[PDB]
Ligand binder design. Structure first.
Ligand code: CLA
Ligand code: CLA
Ligand code: CLA
Ligand code: CLA
Ligand code: CLA
Ligand code: CLA
Ligand code: CLA
Ligand SMILES: CCCCCCCCCCCCCCCCCC(=O)OC[C@H](CO[C@@H]1O[C@H](CO)[C@H](O)[C@H](O)[C@H]1O)OC(=O)CCCCCCCCCCCCCCCCC
Ligand SMILES: CC(=O)O[C@H]1CC(C)(C)C(=C=C/C(C)=C/C=C/C(C)=C/C=C/C=C(C)/C=C/C=C(\C)C(=O)C[C@@]23O[C@]2(C)C[C@@H](O)CC3(C)C)[C@](C)(O)C1
Ligand SMILES: CC1=C(C#C/C(C)=C/C=C/C(C)=C/C=C/C=C(C)/C=C/C=C(C)/C=C/[C@@]23O[C@]2(C)C[C@@H](O)CC3(C)C)C(C)(C)C[C@H](O)C1
Ligand SMILES: CCCCCCCCCCCCO[C@@H]1O[C@H](CO)[C@@H](O[C@H]2O[C@H](CO)[C@@H](O)[C@H](O)[C@H]2O)[C@H](O)[C@H]1O
Lengths: 188, 220, 211, 173, 173
């Protein structure tokens, strides 16, 4: 009857309790929309993709700052987020637009699958069937934990990824550089 | 009030004229929240302990004023304490490590009353009379022979329960004399002119008569 | 029942002072094991603490007199450092290959006591060392065991066994105090007032193996 | 109640001409009762603390670091109050400030029928003392305080107005 | 029942004049309970952590790479806070930050009737001891903290306002 996360208000009607991470947090009623080609199925497919991109982006920033670039790249610089990106583009832009076309082929097909996956309810939101390791032929209670840990880490990574981009473009220093700077100023 | 009536009976047998002297009646209740029985037999054992030390300090005071030992105190040098001089300051002339062995001996020897001697005789509230003593007979049949405290060769075996009570009260009233006996010696030897007929004072004072260590071990 | 047993054995070491536990550590469950498994830990500890101090007492005397082994230990030729002439400094001045292998030796001996037999937290009795020949987790059989290799104690009856452990407990308790008492004289002058001067001072932090 | 009250002795009995015990409630009379109980104990210690401090009893040694017990050789006992230093005067009040708390923080406050103010240091166990002979003592405690409340006012008036008290003005104070 | 519990000792009993234990629900009183339990343990470590090193106890060696334990020879113990470096002052908080979690993440919180904050790193089992003797210890634990909460406020007020505390102002700090 009442939202677990907003206990002063009613729980939204379509937030059944079945998806991982569902604590009934939707105060504005966005799960209710069924117009302009988007709904709870499209919003969940959006969220899981935002999760995944942001989880990779945090490790990708921390990788080439702690350990530097991959072998075959040079002229390392202050921040690894923007300063290296325009630098590599100017250095050798072939591998970076190789990927942009390869992502483009993957996205056009995953977008067809999302529209085909809602018309016939046999594609789980987020599910591309990628389980080469077999986590999921195991315990259903243990696999339901893996579903919630993907969402919980992915939600936290969205703030961290959007964090490291914006304070990279603001301070023009590295992300671990910004953490040690903030440690110095609020030394307390 | 059985414990009260035991205190009243022995106070009549000590002085039937004056009877029951209670100018503070603190022998009918609790100090530590432990019992009227726990209070009286603690005070009975107390006054018993105060007079036993007192008598042992009157005899010890006279002999140290009188002839005292020759032949050496310690290993190196061996100056014996003074012969005529005040016993109260003969205590201060005792060396350092001599004293610490005395107090360590007094700590463990007196402790044997408290446990009752490995049990077999309870603590001073019940069972034992106040001032009794578990006769060493846990330590003596396991390691060696230390004889016994207050009965080295014991000829004190066979007495009537009526005849012990005359000697039970010889412990109190002599010690009640021996508590105020010492104070007359011990007020005389620090301040001039308070004692009636005792002008045999050693001519300076003693120096903090509540000090085990006046020399070389002082607190800050 | 692992509690009546601890009371009864401390009773047989002392008529008076039967079961002594002011901090009430004899009631814990350690990590989370059953109380009975734990009391075995507290016992097996106290024995093992009492066994080394008994061994370090006799060791401390032999280090001091000069009954050092008369040869050099290393292949290159430097002798045993009794030159420093004092038992903590004698353990200071060793090599980068002797101080290890003594700990590494004992580290096999400590370890072998868990495996190769019934563990003390699962019954058994504390301080009971299992024989090398009875277990299979060793490639080659050594000739003699660790405790009593010549087999004297098997002729002694059971009443001289439990009475023998209690004589080891109290002597183990006395020797822990003797080693500590030798430590305090080393680092604090006049820490105990019996030994006026037999120890050199040496502020050397002996609780550290590798300086 | 007015009757069966300690403090009513033989030569006057119930001494209340202006009817002050009737003036409030029962809780009012209990306040005046332990007032006079406390007024007594302060005046008994101040009257006795005036007679000595005037004959030269003189604690040996030093009161504080430089203001040692020369306060008795010359100054009157009404004086030697500013001679006591501030840190010495302070701990006196604060031991009193603590002692007024246990007095107030009992299980039942005395105007609600609870017990009178008892000793803070060393309580032991108290007036389990034969309540017939207890009533005789609380008459003895209050009457000595009644006399001491008058006497400490005599000692002040002699120190301010010379000749205000006949057989007491010829006394060096 | 406020009188029958750890913290209600002899000289005051139930000490609540302004009725704060009644002010909320039973969950409210359990919050204040373990507040005073935690306020005690911080103040007991800060009062003691002040006396010692005001006397020169002095860890041998180096605190950090160049800011070694010269913080005791001269600066007051209220100081040597900014002298401790930031990475040293950081680990302290984070060991605390971690210790505040197990305190909160127990099977039953304490305001729901669960156990009070237990030792975070060495968890010796403490379940076994005689609960009669246990009640005497939790009175000892809180009363020493009550005294230490006052004492650490004395130590701050002496370091800010000289002469704010009589027999304590003549102390080099
Ligand atoms: C540590 C000493 C000490 C302290 C701090 C107190 C404190 C207090 N007493 Mg007190 N008292 C003491 C000793 C002490 N007493 C002794 C030994 C007795 C005899 C049993 C009493 C009998 C007593 C009565 C009858 C009354 C108080 C009262 C009070 C309170 C207010 C009066 C005041 O300011 O006294 C503070 C100052 C005192 C100066 C003087 C006494 C200090 C003595 C001389 C210390 C030396 C005694 C020593 C401990 C004994 C030696 C043996 C030792 C090794 C154990 C206060 C809380 C009053 C009250 O209502 O509540 C307590 C009250 O009416 N006291
Ligand atoms: C002046 C203060 C003072 C007071 C009032 C006491 C009072 C007591 N001491 Mg004690 N003692 C003191 C100072 C004092 N001592 C000092 C300064 C020392 C030297 C450090 C000792 C050393 C000492 C020893 C070595 C022993 C005592 C014992 C006793 C007790 C005799 C009665 C008894 O056994 O009750 C029973 C005990 C109590 C009520 C307190 C302990 C309660 C235990 C923890 C649990 C209760 C179990 C059960 C209900 C009662 C005990 C049964 C018994 C078979 C174990 C009694 C409580 C004996 C004792 O307590 O026997 C067990 C004992 O063996 N004392
Ligand atoms: C069975 C295995 C084994 C093997 C291969 C060795 C081999 C060696 N030991 Mg040895 N050792 C062993 C068991 C063994 N030990 C055991 C069981 C102990 C009992 C604790 C020791 C205790 C020991 C000591 C105390 C010392 C050696 C040293 C040495 C080495 C001489 C090195 C040298 O002088 O410079 C080439 C040599 C390589 C010496 C050493 O390394 O000094 C540099 C040395 O001082 N050993
Ligand atoms: C570093 C290896 C090592 C270790 C840890 C031990 C340990 C032990 N040996 Mg052992 N021993 C060793 C080498 C070792 N030994 C060697 C090289 C031999 C010669 C073959 C022996 C021959 C030996 C015999 C014959 C006996 C022991 C015994 C003992 C036990 C008690 C004696 C003891 O240390 O008292 C402390 C040391 C002294 C008192 C020596 C002072 C001189 C103890 C378990 C005895 C046993 O099983 O237990 C009683 C026993 O009877 N040992
Ligand atoms: C048991 C605790 C205790 C302790 C440690 C002290 C300690 C001290 N008191 Mg004291 N005092 C105590 C209890 C205690 N008092 C009590 C219970 C009372 C009765 C209420 C007093 C009443 C008292 C007086 C009246 C004076 C002191 C003074 C002093 C100080 C002497 C310093 C000096 O000469 O100037 C450096 C000293 C720090 C003296 C002081 O600080 O002023 C010089 C002083 O005048 N004390
Ligand atoms: C067991 C893990 C561990 C490890 C590896 C370290 C390692 C270190 N600590 Mg340490 N520390 C630890 C646990 C640990 N600590 C704990 C549990 C605490 C208590 C909360 C502290 C409290 C502490 C303080 C207070 C300080 C250090 C400092 C240091 C560093 C010294 C570097 C230096 O001198 O400047 C190069 C060093 C890297 C110092 C530091 O980094 O600043 C110089 C410092 O000031 N540590
Ligand atoms: C070996 C290092 C070590 C470390 C990392 C910790 C870590 C911790 N201890 Mg701890 N402790 C240690 C040794 C250590 N302890 C030892 C040897 C003892 C003595 C048995 C204790 C006794 C102890 C108690 C009694 C308490 C802690 C507490 C704590 C926690 C917060 C307080 C703090 O920062 O302590 C830092 C510790 C040190 C710098 C060690 C010196 C924290 C998780 C508290 C806790 O659990 O909070 C609820 C608490 O109350 N400790
Ligand atoms: C290019 C265009 C940019 C995107 C503009 C959004 C239009 C998309 C329409 C679908 C969304 C919708 O219908 O909302 C739907 C939700 C309502 O949510 C549900 O709507 C359903 C029908 O659509 C039902 O009526 C449900 O009852 C109702 O709960 O509307 C809102 O909650 C919006 C709140 C208004 C907040 C305005 C403040 C500032 C917002 C400006 C944001 C800046 C840019 C946006 C990013
Ligand atoms: C020409 C040529 O090459 O020859 C040269 C070669 C070389 C190498 C130079 C030589 C040498 C020098 C050598 C070999 C030096 C060897 C030194 C050696 C062998 C030193 C042992 C220490 C043992 C210790 C400390 C044991 C402690 C034992 C301890 C602390 C215990 O209490 C064990 C205990 O276990 C019990 C009893 C029961 C258990 O419940 C509990 C534990 C585990 C705690 C020679 C001899 O010169 C010859
Ligand atoms: C046709 C079709 C479909 C479709 C479709 C459509 C319209 C697909 C189109 C998708 C589209 C248009 C996807 C854009 C992505 C842009 C990205 C990721 C930009 C990243 C940019 C990033 C991460 C940062 C960029 C920077 O600029 C920043 C912020 C700072 C600058 O200094 C420079 C840089 C570069 C650093 C459906 C919907 C599936 C339905 C049907 O089924 C089939
Ligand atoms: C520093 C600024 C100076 C301002 C100081 C002002 C003093 C504060 C006023 C003290 C009152 C607080 O004390 C608190 O009062 C509230 C409401 O009256 C009481 O409220 C509680 O008990 C009362 C009974 O009186 C119930 O009716 C009520 O249901 C319950 O919540 C609490 O039992 C009491 O703990």
């Amino acid at each position: 009857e009442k939202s677990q996360s907003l206990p002063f208000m009613n729980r939204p009607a379509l937030l059944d309790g079945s998806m991982a991470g569902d604590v009934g947090f939707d105060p504005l009623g966005l799960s209710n929309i069924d117009d302009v080609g988007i709904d709870l199925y499209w919003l969940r497919e959006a969220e899981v993709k935002h999760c995944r991109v942001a989880m990779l982006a945090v490790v990708g920033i921390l990788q080439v700052e702690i350990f530097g670039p991959a072998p075959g790249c040079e002229m390392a610089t202050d921040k690894c987020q923007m300063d290296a990106f325009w630098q590599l583009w100017g250095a050798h832009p072939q591998y970076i637009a190789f990927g942009l076309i390869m992502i483009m082929m993957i996205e056009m097909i995953s977008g067809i699958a999302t529209t085909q996956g809602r018309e016939s309810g046999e594609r789980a939101p987020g599910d591309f069937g990628l389980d080469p390791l077999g986590y999921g032929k195991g315990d259903a209670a243990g696999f339901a934990r893996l579903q919630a840990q993907e969402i919980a880490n992915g939600r936290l990574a969205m703030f961290a990824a959007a964090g490291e981009i914006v304070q990279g473009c603001t301070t023009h220093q590295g992300a671990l550089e910004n953490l040690m700077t903030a440690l110095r100023d609020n030394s307390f | 009030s059985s414990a009260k009536a035991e205190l009243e009976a022995i106070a009549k047998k000590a002085n039937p004229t004056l009877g029951y002297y209670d100018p503070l009646s603190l022998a009918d209740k609790d100090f530590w929240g432990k019992g009227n029985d726990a209070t009286i037999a603690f005070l009975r054992q107390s006054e018993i302990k105060h007079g036993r030390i007192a008598m042992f300090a009157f005899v010890g005071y006279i002999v140290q004023s009188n002839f005292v030992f020759p032949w050496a105190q310690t290993l190196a040098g061996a100056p014996h304490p003074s012969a005529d001089l005040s016993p109260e300051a003969q205590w201060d002339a005792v060396p350092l490590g001599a004293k610490w062995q005395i107090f360590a001996v007094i700590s463990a020897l007196e402790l044997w009353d408290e446990c009752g001697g490995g049990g077999a005789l309870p603590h001073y509230t019940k069972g034992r009379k106040p001032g009794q003593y578990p006769p060493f007979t846990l330590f003596r049949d396991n390691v060696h022979f230390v004889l016994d405290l207050y009965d080295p060769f014991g000829f004190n075996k066979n007495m009537s329960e009526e005849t012990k009570e005359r000697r039970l009260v010889s412990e109190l009233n002599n010690g009640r004399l021996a508590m105020l006996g010492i104070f007359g010696f011990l007020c005389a030897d620090t301040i001039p002119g308070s004692v009636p007929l005792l002008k045999d004072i050693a001519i300076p004072y003693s120096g903090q008569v509540m000090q085990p260590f006046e020399g070389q071990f002082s607190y800050f | 029942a692992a509690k009546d047993d601890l009371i009864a054995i401390a009773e047989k070491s002392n008529p008076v002072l039967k079961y002594y536990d002011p901090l009430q550590l004899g009631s814990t469950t350690i990590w989370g094991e059953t109380n009975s498994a734990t009391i075995g830990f507290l016992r097996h500890s106290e024995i093992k603490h009492g066994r080394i101090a008994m061994a370090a007492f006799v060791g401390y005397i032999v280090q001091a007199n000069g009954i050092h082994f008369p040869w050099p230990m290393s292949f290159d030729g430097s002798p045993f450092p009794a030159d420093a002439g004092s038992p903590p400094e004698q353990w200071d001045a060793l090599s980068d290959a002797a101080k290890w292998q003594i700990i590494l030796f004992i580290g096999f001996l400590e370890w072998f006591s868990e495996a190769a037999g019934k563990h003390y937290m699962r019954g058994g009795k504390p301080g009971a060392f299992p024989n090398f020949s009875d277990s299979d987790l060793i490639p080659h059989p050594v000739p003699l065991n660790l405790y009593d290799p010549f087999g004297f104690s098997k002729g002694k009856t059971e009443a001289q066994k439990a009475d023998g452990l209690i004589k080891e407990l109290n002597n183990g308790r006395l020797a822990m105090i003797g080693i500590m008492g030798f430590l305090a004289e080393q680092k604090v002058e006049g820490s105990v007032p019996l030994l006026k001067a037999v120890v050199p001072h040496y502020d050397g932090e002996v609780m550290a193996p590798f300086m | 109640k007015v009757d069966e009250m300690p403090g009513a002795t033989a030569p006057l009995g119930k001494f209340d001409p202006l009817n002050l015990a009737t003036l409030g409630s029962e809780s009012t009379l209990a306040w005046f009762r332990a007032a006079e109980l406390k007024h007594s104990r302060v005046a008994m210690l101040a009257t006795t603390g005036y007679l000595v401090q005037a004959a030269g009893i003189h604690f040996p040694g030093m009161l504080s670091s430089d203001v040692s017990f020369e306060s008795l050789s010359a100054m009157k006992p009404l004086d030697a109050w500013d001679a006591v230093p501030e840190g010495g005067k302070n701990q006196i009040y604060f031991t009193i400030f603590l002692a007024e708390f246990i007095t107030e923080c009992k299980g039942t406050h005395y105007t609600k029928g609870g017990p009178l103010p008892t000793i803070v240091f060393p309580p032991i166990d108290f007036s389990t003392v034969n309540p017939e002979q207890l009533k005789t003592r609380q008459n003895r405690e209050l009457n000595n305080g009644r006399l001491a409340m008058i006497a400490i006012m005599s000692f002040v008036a002699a120190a301010n107005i010379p000749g205000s008290v006949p057989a007491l003005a010829g006394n060096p104070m």
